[PDB]
Design a protein around this ligand. Structure first.
Ligand SMILES: CCCCCC/C=C\CCCCCCCCCC(=O)O[C@H](COC(=O)CCCCCCCCCCCCCCC)COP(=O)(O)OC[C@@H](O)CO
Ligand SMILES: CCCCCCCCCCCO[C@@H]1O[C@H](CO)[C@@H](O[C@H]2O[C@H](CO)[C@@H](O)[C@H](O)[C@H]2O)[C@H](O)[C@H]1O
Ligand SMILES: Nc1ncnc2c1ncn2[C@@H]1O[C@H](COP(=O)(O)OP(=O)(O)NP(=O)(O)O)[C@@H](O)[C@H]1O
Ligand SMILES: Nc1ncnc2c1ncn2[C@@H]1O[C@H](COP(=O)(O)OP(=O)(O)NP(=O)(O)O)[C@@H](O)[C@H]1O
Ligand SMILES: [Mg+2]
Ligand SMILES: [Mg+2]
Lengths: 289, 371, 490, 370, 371
């Protein structure tokens, strides 16, 4: 019977992957089609490498014979995205983990209220959020310019406030870990910091990966806030940079699609690297019961 | 440090698992807690270590009121009933964890981890993680972790329960030597009567959240204060059978056995609040029943069960006008069949007697080995 | 490091206070007060050891205050004002804008700048009479008046170029030139002197009076405009922001036209969100379970492929779906027509459009739920399944009796959050269906796929009255009170 | 607060911003004043936010329709080009940049839709919309079609709808009457009825959108399409031998495409208005200046008469200008946002059979006016 | 159902945890696995259950090969060493879990859950979660969950280890009552010698992966095959003294004690292949040593440890020239103390003798109860 389920699973997964990959293959197709066209065959009739050439830093020899150098530094935009998403992801993990630990293991007044509040206030549709943020970062810039307008620090600093859900997520996971491990830690003389760092985090490593992954993705794909704070072309992230390809009456689809595909590269890599922390059985053998 | 509990009460809402508990564990005392599974032995340990809150009353360690002190600051170590091993760390790392938090020399950590590991017979398992150990090995890891820490107050919660007999004996001894070397307070919870009898300076018997009795091992065995303690200390348990008081003296009680023949026996037991005609419970241990040939007071009946333990034979006998069977122990292997008629002797010096309320009429026969 | 703590606490509490007083200068008071309480709370927390717990919470809370709560409050605050593209400036900036307005009160002369040694001469040319005028030698510096003289001759100096005119434009702009017939003229461009003058002059009590018409205007702080004068019926542009009490909040309850489709739009948004959350959780959880199955031999590859819909920005993906779903063209209906002989009306028919929308959102949303479940599944001990096998469990029984129940608890707050997000998933509807097809009869227009936010956005930002930020903020706060109430009960 | 003694310019990223920067270098050489050109994302939305506080660029370049909004908000300076300077540009482009009867930006370029056709399939394109049904029939015999354009977006279908009397908001003489809307008049019905008939007789399909229409023309599946100057380079790379000409007439009257006029506004908060005037009037709006921008990225038809006459030697640009002049200037009032949605829906309703042409246009009239 | 292992092996990489195991457990047979903590008992039980793969060899259940069969389809149930309770479910729901999966007859579930909860004394804990339970209560919940299911084969891994001596007796008896009613194969791991002696039809002594010996309780007690089994079955363990073979007769071996007097005694054991001058180990149980005054062969020495168990006194004696203390058991309380001189009788017929490799020379003295 176990052979029957496995083959069926393989069959249904492949069919399911085929379906969900189809839209993405059409994006890849757009990026290899000559000119800028949103529709066409899966394998484009007229193939072109120019969209990728320009995206990768290559100049292009076009019909009339003159050389077209790359209008934009796409790879630099990609690096900027990795930097902003990477540093902000670390910051978010570090901030929400410590928060979670308190909520999950410590007594203090208005704790239930704070968690209700964190959840509820992040649900607010702040339609005028950009107006508020611009004003904050404009003033902040006069005093700490390292985190003001037109800085990566600023973009990163802005993302560090999006932790409420991550705090709930990590909290919940901490609560699956039997507390006697930390109790025994305490009796061995461990401070709450030491029990947190040396006992709990090592066993919580799967959810730390989840939070890093979710935060990286969020940051790599973010437009409005980065677009609002970043001014200089050489500081743009990729998500902001590729907005240059969109105009009121037409889109440079080919260039935009190639940018969209490049943006999936750092995410795929981080997802792969994150798997070493996604392991079962971390608590096995600790607690009888 | 000394440990004292003054009117300690513990309630999980309306359920009360500790009632006005008063104990006084002196400096360097080895105290064993025994009692039925579910009675509150672990709860007492957890309240002392600071892992469970105290509903009311006062806990003192080394003369300091510790009710609100954090666990890390009580001078307490514990071998958890559930072991509570660090599953991400090896045996060595489990055993050396506490010493690393204190900034101990690496050589000092390796010296005394190897020392504890050798006696526990875990030396070849130092690299293993808890998941890759047997149930009894895990337990020994939990023992060795607390041994290395050498706290001022040792709590052991059923620390030998998953070990072979031969090894249990070897661990009994090491714990006993440790207490003699360090002279520090040890509070040891066990269901094993031999551990209790050989380790304890003093045994605390619990019963549904109350302290039923406290005393030296031989004190509880020979002189249980009531029926419950009498039925709990010593296994196979003491036999009980209803009797009727026929006459009294200041230092003895005459009772009529329930058999058709109404045999009367004087017991060397007090007659305080013991009235003629009252229904009592006569306790006699399986080990204390004698062969029939060398006996005055005879009880005869039909054999119901025979357990051959090799060293001895335990024989359960059904005796007319007594609902419960009589359990008898005899040295060596004895060939008996179910249904056979068996007689045993009932020695009056070694009979306990319990009032309607369950309280013991104190025995006045003097047993060698108790003050 | 023992006495190091209080010096580090002291050194940081020195930067604080320094930064606060430095903010008290210019006049950033909201910023200086807010920066003070926040720092003090933090310094207090790390100073005394009975606030230990708050040390873990404060850094995260602080960030949340700045970048979630502050924007939240501003939005709420703006709800009580007429802040819009019509009334966008502060009163000060509006007045300032009005005071820069000019009108041409006379003649216009091309001018030239000519050196006379180390001094200068100004020439003006009147194109409409063929007369030219030339001043005596003057030096640059401050407000001076130059009498000009009609002339038939040329200046001795070589005409100054644009570079020189520019360098000296400030001093040049302070010169008042007087023609022989007693007409004042001043620099209006880099090439010309003219009778340009202010359109309005500010009184002192606050009355703006138009120099050209003689009409008088005063600031009307009810509607946020300078209005003529006792109030006349003419309003100057630009208007300015002003408090409007409950106005934006009432209009939502006042207007019966905007209320007609509300309930039907509300039910669809709820149903859209519920189904999205259910399907993304179900699809994501099941996939997470499969891709950790020890026996599945390609799981490492499947895992990565399955999250790729989330690796690509959703913008291009949605627009591509729009193409794939085209009723006549587009590859889905071409597949469906060749196989099953049908072409679903994915844009024209309400129910089919909604099915499409949910299909695309599930494609968008499952990876999120999958990744969460990938981590959460690691919290379930393997021996629970050893016990379940000894109890006679199969894989479907394990899923429903053990796996699902142990995951629903940690998932609950995440699902509630996902419901709120999807409740306001403005962008998906805009790009895919634009809210269509049309609900016929809707005075203010609505379609069958519109979420509340889409309809609302249209009223506030389209609908012909410019961008009404006040109204948007007010609505946003109302729909918050609604979904905040739906989330607290759920 | 904007920096004195410099010029910051914002222009969209699909214009020749490198060209405009070279014009900026000449200005610098002649004046000492540095000119910086930027092309941020969503500059049309960022401008009103930074300008309202008194910052932002000195000069903004965008389509004129948005400048009515900025002007009303108090963000644009009133410009002062004299009689002579105005005569250098086409009079109708000045109409595109008035707010309350006053000029508020310099027209730069002119944009409208033209008829684009395949020379190889259709050497002589039709002068009339009425010629199209018959022409599609002889093309269908060779497995092709006559006309495929975007029917989803009213920008593309308006030219035909407006021809016989349809209009957005009636323009009096520098004042759009906001309650005089011409979407449900006889002219609009006739135009929209002819469009629906093309669909009914299967000469076109109701859910032909931009991408499908563009792809069909670029691959040679259709003889004609309707599109703007931005579409030309895709066709160049397709190598389809194509022409661009005047849109077909409906009932003897010209198709009236919407006109978009790239315009340069001066920031009301700028301390450098005079510098901006000189740059705009004497440097950019010259044959030399516009050529520098065009050379970088083509501007299409321009508002400067002298340079338009040189560009119109390309029949594609001449065609753009001809269609623009017969077209309707895009109104620059806020009420247009209602127009777009209401009309888009009404065409969808008619093309898909959800409503009659009459009802669909009636309801669209009602939604705009009240 | 029957269970059978043929040349069954287990290896974690290159570490043989179970070495070529042959067991033929018949239908309805109560088999008990014993052996040192870490010898491979649970590994065996799990390999039978399907929770662990078999490196090589053949496992059969009900005359069907199960090696590659999923544990759920093997007709077994297990009381886990570490309980492995469902934390999200109550006691009732934990206990009823297997029955719900198989065929939820609500009346039948409630009835059987109530009945099993009664005997386990869990009836007042039905709506608790595992976390709100004692250690021994959890253990009983694990027992209840297997017993409610009534599988064709019961597997129990140290299932009474955390219960009080008195409750433990009641569970021994109930597991016996259940075995005789159902008549199903039960495989039962334990470190308790009484449980092994009283429950087992057959006892399997395991040692570092191998099967040391298989037999009836008294067979293993009276006639251990080797030094290891001899030292494992029986607690306190069998004493061991080195000897030398002096002379040999046709059916009994003579040896010499190492102590200064050099006394020579004839042991009734098999002579087959035993040479003169070979170093043997002579074995005598503490129960089998006699009072000195009675027997012929006397060993005298100094008392080192005295353990007072109440029912008996256990006395460790250091004899000159011997290095391991001699443990002696005597009934009742014996007033003797550390330092005293104590001698005992060594009965020839109960002395075991083991070769240099550790194998026992078959004892020819007939002991009772080994038919
Ligand atoms: C509407 C939902 C649509 C889902 C679309 C998914 C698209 C991909 C196609 C996959 C189709 C499923 C086919 C299943 C085939 C059998 C799989 C199988 O047989 O493999 C099982 C994998 O389990 C597992 O993912 C669990 C097996 C799946 C259980 C089926 C549940 C489907 C219903 C979902 C409802 C979710 C609940 C609502 C949430 C709010 C093996 O598990 P076991 O080893 O027994 O135990 C668990 C181990 O940890 C033991 O150590
Ligand atoms: C989905 C991912 C798709 C990946 C995209 C494809 C990878 C990029 C193509 C690899 C480079 O391919 C191409 O190489 C040729 C020379 O060999 C380059 O040509 C250029 O450099 C050569 C010298 O090296 C010159 O002689 C030539 O005039 C110039 O055009 C061209 O600019 C580059 O673009
Ligand atoms: N994953 C593993 N890798 C290597 N060795 C292991 C692993 N798991 C268990 N062992 C060893 O295998 C041996 C047998 O384990 P096990 O079968 O649990 O013994 P047991 O007889 O049940 N002991 P106990 O439970 O203490 O009475 C022990 O020596 C273990 O340390
Ligand atoms: N969280 C809780 N809520 C309610 N009751 C509890 C909780 N924890 C334990 N109990 C009960 O409190 C009593 C004492 O528990 P415990 O102290 O573990 O007993 P114990 O004597 O250690 N039993 P054992 O370990 O089986 O020998 C038992 O009846 C438990 O069922
Ligand atoms: Mg306990
Ligand atoms: Mg085991």
């Amino acid at each position: 019977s176990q052979k029957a389920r496995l083959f069926i699973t393989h069959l249904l997964l492949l069919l399911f992957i085929a379906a969900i990959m189809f839209p993405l293959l059409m994006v890849v197709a757009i990026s290899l089609r000559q000119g800028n066209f949103a529709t066409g065959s899966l394998i484009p009739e007229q193939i072109s490498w120019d969209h990728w050439k320009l995206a990768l830093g290559f100049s292009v020899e076009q019909a009339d014979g003159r050389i077209t150098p790359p209008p934009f530094p796409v790879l630099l935009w990609l690096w900027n995205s990795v930097k902003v998403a990477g540093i902000s992801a670390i910051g978010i993990v570090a901030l929400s983990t410590t928060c979670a630990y308190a909520f999950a293991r410590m007594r203090f007044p208005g704790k239930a209220t704070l968690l209700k509040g964190m959840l509820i206030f992040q649900m607010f549709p702040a339609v005028l959020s950009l107006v508020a943020l611009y004003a904050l970062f404009d003033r902040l810039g006069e005093y700490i310019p390292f985190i003001g307008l037109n800085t990566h620090g600023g973009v990163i600093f802005a993302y560090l406030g999006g932790i409420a859900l991550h705090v709930w997520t990590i909290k919940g996971y901490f609560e699956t870990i039997d507390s006697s491990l930390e109790e025994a830690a305490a009796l061995d003389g461990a401070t709450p910091w030491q029990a947190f760092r040396l006992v709990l985090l090592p066993l919580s490593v799967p959810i730390l990966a989840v939070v890093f992954i979710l935060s990286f993705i969020a940051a790599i794909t973010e437009v409005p806030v980065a677009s609002l704070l970043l001014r200089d072309v050489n500081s743009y992230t990729l998500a902001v940079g590729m907005q240059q390809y969109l105009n009121p009456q037409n889109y440079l689809w080919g260039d935009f699609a190639a940018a969209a595909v490049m943006s999936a590269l750092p995410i795929t890599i981080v997802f792969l690297l994150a798997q070493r922390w996604l392991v079962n059985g971390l608590t096995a053998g600790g607690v009888k019961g | 440090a000394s440990v004292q509990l003054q009117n300690v009460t513990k309630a999980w809402g309306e359920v009360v698992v500790s009632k006005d508990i008063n104990l006084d564990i002196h400096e360097g005392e080895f105290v064993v807690f025994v009692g039925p599974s579910g009675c509150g032995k672990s709860t007492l340990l957890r309240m002392i270590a600071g892992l469970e809150t105290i509903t009311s009353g006062d806990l003192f360690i080394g003369e300091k009121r510790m009710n609100d002190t954090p666990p890390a600051e009580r001078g307490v170590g514990m071998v958890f009933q559930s072991y509570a091993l660090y599953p991400h760390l090896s045996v060595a790392e489990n055993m050396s964890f506490g010493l690393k938090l204190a900034g101990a020399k690496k050589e000092v950590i390796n010296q005394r981890v190897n020392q504890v590991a050798e006696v526990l017979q875990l030396a070849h398992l130092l690299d293993r993680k808890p998941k890759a150990l047997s149930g009894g090995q895990r337990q020994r890891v939990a023992i060795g972790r607390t041994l290395v820490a050498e706290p001022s107050v040792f709590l052991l919660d059923e620390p030998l329960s998953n070990l072979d007999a031969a090894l249990r004996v070897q661990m009994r001894i090491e714990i006993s030597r440790l207490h003699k070397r360090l002279g520090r307070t040890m509070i040891y919870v066990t269901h094993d009567q031999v551990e209790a009898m050989t380790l304890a300076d003093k045994i605390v018997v619990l019963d549904a959240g109350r302290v039923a009795q406290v005393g030296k091992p031989l004190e509880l065995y020979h002189y249980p204060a009531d029926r419950f303690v009498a039925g709990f200390i010593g296994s196979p348990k003491m036999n009980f059978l209803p009797v009727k008081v026929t006459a009294t003296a200041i230092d003895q009680v005459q009772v009529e056995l329930p058999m058709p023949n109404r045999q009367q026996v004087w017991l060397p037991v007090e007659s305080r609040d013991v009235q003629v005609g009252a229904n009592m419970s006569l306790g006699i241990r399986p080990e204390h029943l004698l062969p029939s040939d060398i006996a005055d007071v005879i009880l005869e009946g039909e054999v119901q069960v025979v357990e051959q333990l090799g060293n001895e034979t335990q024989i359960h006998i059904q005796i007319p006008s007594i609902r419960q069977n009589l359990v008898y122990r005899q040295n060596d292997v004895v060939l008996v069949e179910e249904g056979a008629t068996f007689a045993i002797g009932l020695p009056p010096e070694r009979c306990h007697l319990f009032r309607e309320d369950g309280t013991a009429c104190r025995r006045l026969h003097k047993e060698p080995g108790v003050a | 490091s023992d006495a190091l703590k209080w010096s580090v606490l002291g050194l940081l509490g020195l930067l604080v206070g320094y930064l606060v007083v430095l903010m008290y200068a210019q006049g950033e008071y909201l910023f200086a007060i807010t920066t003070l309480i926040l720092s003090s709370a933090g310094l207090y927390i790390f100073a005394n050891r009975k606030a230990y717990a708050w040390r873990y919470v404060y850094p995260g809370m602080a960030g949340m205050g700045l970048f979630v709560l502050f924007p939240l409050v501003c939005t709420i605050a703006i709800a009580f004002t007429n802040y819009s593209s019509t009334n966008q400036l502060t009163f000060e900036r509006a007045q300032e804008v009005l005071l820069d307005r000019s009108w041409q009160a006379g003649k216009t002369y091309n001018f030239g700048l000519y050196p006379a040694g180390d001094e200068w001469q100004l020439a003006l040319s009147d194109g409409e009479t063929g007369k030219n005028y030339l001043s005596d030698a003057f030096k640059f510096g401050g407000e001076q008046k130059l009498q000009l003289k009609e002339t038939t001759a040329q200046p001795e100096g070589e005409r100054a170029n644009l570079r020189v005119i520019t360098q000296n434009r400030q001093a040049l702009s302070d010169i008042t030139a007087i023609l022989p017939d007693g007409n004042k003229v001043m620099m209006s461009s880099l090439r010309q002197f003219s009778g340009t003058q202010p359109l309005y002059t500010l009184d002192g009590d606050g009355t703006l009076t138009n120099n050209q018409s003689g009409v008088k205007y005063r600031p009307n702080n009810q509607i946020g405009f300078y209005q003529s004068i006792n109030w006349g019926d003419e309003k100057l542009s630009p208007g300015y922001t002003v408090t409007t009490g409950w106005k934006n909040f009432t209009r939502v309850f006042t207007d019966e036209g905007i209320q007609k489709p509300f309930l039907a739009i509300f039910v669809w948004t709820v149903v859209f969100s519920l189904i999205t959350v259910f399907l993304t959780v179900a699809v994501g959880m099941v996939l997470a379970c499969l891709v950790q199955w020890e026996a599945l031999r390609g799981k490492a590859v499947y895992r990565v492929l399955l999250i790729l819909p989330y690796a690509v920005p959703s913008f291009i993906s949605i627009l591509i779906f729009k193409g794939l779903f085209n009723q006549s063209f587009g590859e889905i209906n071409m597949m469906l027509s060749a196989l099953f002989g049908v072409k679903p009306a994915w844009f024209s028919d309400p129910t089919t459009a909604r099915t499409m929308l949910i299909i695309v959102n599930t494609w968008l949303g499952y990876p999120y739920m999958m990744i969460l479940c990938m981590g959460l599944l690691k919290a379930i001990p393997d021996d629970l399944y050893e016990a379940s096998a000894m109890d006679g469990a199969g894989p479907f029984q394990n899923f429903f009796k053990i796996t699902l129940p142990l995951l629903i608890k940690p998932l609950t707050p995440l699902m509630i959050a996902s419901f709120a997000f999807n409740f306001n998933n403005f962008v998906l509807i805009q790009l895919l269906t634009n809210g269509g097809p049309d609900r016929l009869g809707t005075t203010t227009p609505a379609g069958y796929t519109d979420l509340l936010v889409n309809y609302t956005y249209r009223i506030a930002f389209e609908g012909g009255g410019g961008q009404d930020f006040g109204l948007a903020a007010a609505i946003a706060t109302l729909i918050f009170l609604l979904v905040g109430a739906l989330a607290i009960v759920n | 607060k904007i920096e004195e003694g410099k010029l910051v310019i914002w222009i969209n990223g699909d214009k020749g911003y490198n060209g405009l920067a070279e014009v900026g270098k000449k200005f610098e050489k002649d004046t000492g004043i540095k000119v910086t050109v930027e092309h941020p994302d969503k500059l049309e939305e960022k401008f009103p936010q930074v300008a309202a506080t008194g910052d932002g660029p000195d000069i903004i370049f965008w389509a004129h329709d948005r400048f009515g909004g900025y002007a009303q908000s108090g963000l644009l300076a009133e410009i002062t080009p004299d009689k002579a300077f105005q005569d250098k540009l086409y009079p109708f482009t000045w109409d595109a940049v008035r707010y309350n009867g006053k000029l508020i930006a310099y027209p730069i370029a002119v944009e409208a839709l033209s008829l684009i056709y395949n020379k190889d399939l259709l050497p002589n394109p039709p002068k009339t919309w009425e010629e199209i049904p018959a022409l599609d029939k002889e093309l269908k015999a060779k497995g092709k079609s006559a006309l495929m354009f975007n029917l989803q977006e009213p920008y593309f279908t308006w030219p035909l709808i407006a021809a016989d009397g349809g209009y957005a908001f009636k323009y009096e003489n520098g004042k759009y009457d906001i309650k005089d809307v011409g979407v449900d008049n006889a002219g609009a019905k006739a135009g929209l009825t002819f469009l629906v008939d093309l669909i009914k007789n299967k000469h076109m399909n109701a859910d032909t959108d931009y991408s499908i229409a563009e792809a069909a023309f670029n691959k040679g599946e259709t003889a004609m399409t309707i599109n703007g100057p931005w579409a030309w380079s895709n066709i160049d790379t397709s190598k389809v031998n194509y022409g661009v000409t005047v849109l077909p007439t409906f009932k003897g009257q010209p198709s009236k495409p919407f006109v978009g006029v790239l315009s340069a506004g001066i920031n009301a908060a700028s301390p450098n208005k005079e510098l901006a005037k000189e740059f705009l009037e004497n440097y950019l709006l010259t044959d030399e200046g516009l050529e520098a921008v065009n050379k970088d990225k083509p501007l299409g038809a321009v508002a400067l008469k002298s340079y338009e006459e040189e560009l119109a030697k390309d029949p594609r640009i001449a065609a753009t200008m001809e269609n623009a002049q017969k077209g309707e200037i895009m109104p620059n009032i806020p009420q247009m946002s209602a127009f777009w949605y209401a009309v888009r829906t009404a065409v969808i309703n008619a093309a898909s059979g959800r409503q009659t042409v009459d009802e669909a246009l009636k309801d669209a009239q009602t939604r705009i006016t009240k």
